[PDB]
Structures are given as C-alpha cells and as structure tokens.
Design a protein around this ligand. Structure first.
Ligand code: CL
Ligand code: CL
Ligand code: MG
Ligand code: MG
Lengths: 168, 167
C-alpha cells in the first residue's frame, strides 16, 4: 500500500488566486493570471502574513473528490512549509481539517525540504522540491512552472486521477 | 552523498523533564526525585507545559551542541518534533538560538516519525523508534529504562561514541 505526499500551496489550495485578488483590490490593479506564466508575482508579503490568510483559501478544483478516491488505495500525507510564514502554522492545519476531514490528522507534516519525506509519490508545484524528493516526483502545473520540463507533469486534479489510474 | 540523522527534541536535545520537575517542585513545594521516575512519565504538568515560553527556556542536554555540530560535518541533520499553542514558535526560536549551525529547512514538525526518510533517528520514545524505517537509536530517559529492543545511547558523548564506532 503505497504513500502519496501532497503539497498544499498551489496544489491543494489556491494560494496564488488569493494573493492576486487581494493585490488587485488593495492597489487597484488588474493583474491577469496569464501574465504570471514562468514568473513569480511587499504588500504581497504583508498579505501572506495576515492572520487568517491561509484559513480562507479556496480548494483547487476536484481536489477533494480525487484525494478521497486516492485514499481508498493509497496512504495520503500532506506536506507544507513551516518556516515559510511561521505565524500561519495553525491556520494551515485548520484549513486541512476543514477541507480534508477524511484524512488522518497525524498525516500532516510541516517541513522545508521535502527530501525528508518517506513516500512513493510527491505531488508538488515547486521544481526545487521535485528535484530533491527521493520517490517519484509529480509536477502539478502552476503559472510559475509552465516552462519546466524535467518532471512528469499533471495539469489539474483530473490529470492526477488519470495518472494514478494508468499505473494501476 | 551524505547520510542523514533525524534527532528528536524533548528529552533528547532539550532537558524537558528537568524543567518540568523543577517547576513542579517550586509550585507544589515538592522534592520529586528522578530516581522515583524510573519507568514513569509524570493537571498542572499540562499547565506548565502549555505556558508560553516553556520550551524557549529549556536547558540544552549536556554536550548536545558540540556532538551535533561534529555529526553535522559528516551527516545532514534534521530535527523532528511535535508542536501546544505557542510551542511551535518557542521550539524554533530555541533551535535558532542554541543550534544556529543547523538549517531551519531541516526542521520537521510531525506527529509520527514513520514519515521521515533518514538513515538514523535518535529519539527517547520507543513508540516512534518502533515505526521509524531507518536505524532507530534510543536515547536514554527515565521513562524508557526497561525498553530493550533498540540500540541504546546514554547521553551525547555516548552518541558520539556510537557514530565513531561505525566509522
Ligand atoms: Cl498545529
Ligand atoms: Cl534525487
Ligand atoms: Mg506549492
Ligand atoms: Mg522525545
């Protein structure tokens, strides 16, 4: 029975959509999502560090239904940065409890470098974690990584379900 | 490539039990002896543990800074702990203060250490040691003195002697 580790930001949670929305509201801009392809987005840091920010994020389309399915055959762990935005440790945990209530809360791990994670698969948007992970790395598409080619790529949660269906 | 050692915080890097005993003695005016705690784990203990700053103020286990720094010459070092409202902040600040040579990207907050990919785990809790998939190294604590399944080290100069012996 194999183990899949899943990153939170830009994979399970729509962290980028939330930041852009807040920036557009506050600084009165019209940043389009497309314009961030291959790129990374002061006010932003302050948006990310506001209490509740990680609590209020949207779930990525189809992520709940797909992860609930994968959980029938795979052990699921959720992995996320701790020292990135220290003050949001609790909000992230509470978001996972709200939106992924069917997962064992003991399977939530906070770490920097995900090479410490013992699992067969890692679903992550960050190439820097995909390159160091010691299982099979699966790259979840995000605007910043659209020009990366080294890793097996999945664009969305339906793509995730299809990948796992193909190796079973 | 470097091999990796995962190290637990409480009762391994940090003298958590010394702190709790001290606090209990002061408050309940007791004189609990450690020799009374062999095999034992010990509402006001929870209250002591949950006071903001408790984990920030722990003493470092003798020789831990020196031996972990030396081990870091040859092995990548990860710190694993559960983290308890202010405990996350207090623990990380404590590591930054007392172990500044360690990389914070290697701090791991989890409940069950079966998720950790490392060659070695140094931990006092036999429940963690039993589920770890690397080499489990038991660090001696009052509560574990009758556990015999795992390789035992008593103190950090003994941990150094263990790693020296395999080199
Ligand atoms: Cl938490
Ligand atoms: Cl690798
Ligand atoms: Mg991410
Ligand atoms: Mg411990």
């Amino acid at each position: 029975r194999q183990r899949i580790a899943i990153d939170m930001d830009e994979v399970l949670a729509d962290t980028l959509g939330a930041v852009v929305k807040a920036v557009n509201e506050r600084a009165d801009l019209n940043i389009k999502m497309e314009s961030l392809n291959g790129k990374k987005l002061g006010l932003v840091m302050d948006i990310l560090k506001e209490p509740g920010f990680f609590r209020n994020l949207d779930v990525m389309p189809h992520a709940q239904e797909v992860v609930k399915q994968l959980n029938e055959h795979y052990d699921i762990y959720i992995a996320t940065a701790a020292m990135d935005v220290p003050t949001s440790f609790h909000d992230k945990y509470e978001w996972l409890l709200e939106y992924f209530p069917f997962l064992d809360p003991q399977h939530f791990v906070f770490c920097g470098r995900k090479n410490i994670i013992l699992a067969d698969y890692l679903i992550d948007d960050n190439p820097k974690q995909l390159e160091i992970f010691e299982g099979k790395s699966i790259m979840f598409t995000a605007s910043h990584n659209v020009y990366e080619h080294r890793f097996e790529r999945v664009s969305g949660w339906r793509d995730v379900k299809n990948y796992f269906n193909s190796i079973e």
